[PDB]
Design a protein around this ligand. Structure first.
Ligand SMILES: [Ca+2]
Length: 126
């Protein structure tokens, strides 16, 4: 039920893009194949997504941030910010590091990151 290479979890198709890109390049790459950088809304979705990110659980971009107004988090896929997994000392909430990166540090958790940093990414389409 997903296109070749994409992986199904509860009605949504996901793809890991290993190419290291800034957040906007990563979003554009998802969009070229009809997708967005992913959102996360449950523990099971989160585990499924982590399992796409190589054995290394590579630090990766998600489709979230607070880049318009600090502390106001939004996803790119029309869903709301509900579930989060902030690392200790996150989020900073500063506009200079406003894009959400997952798989950060030993704890494999979220950190609001300068959007120009280069990371792999997770795309999703439903
Ligand atoms: Ca941060």
């Amino acid at each position: 039920e997903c296109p070749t290479d994409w992986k199904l979890f509860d009605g949504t198709c996901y793809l890991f893009n290993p190419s290291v890109l800034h957040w906007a390049d990563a979003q554009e790459s998802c969009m070229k194949e009809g997708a967005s950088l992913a959102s996360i809304h449950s523990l099971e979705q989160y585990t499924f997504v982590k399992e796409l990110t190589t054995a290394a659980l590579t630090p990766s971009w998600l489709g979230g941030g607070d880049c318009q107004v600090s502390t106001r988090w939004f996803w790119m896929d029309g869903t709301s910010m509900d579930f989060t997994d902030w690392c200790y000392a996150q989020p900073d909430t500063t506009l200079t590091e406003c894009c959400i990166q997952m798989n950060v540090g030993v704890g494999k958790c979220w950190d609001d990151t300068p959007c120009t940093h280069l990371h792999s990414s997770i795309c999703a389409k439903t």
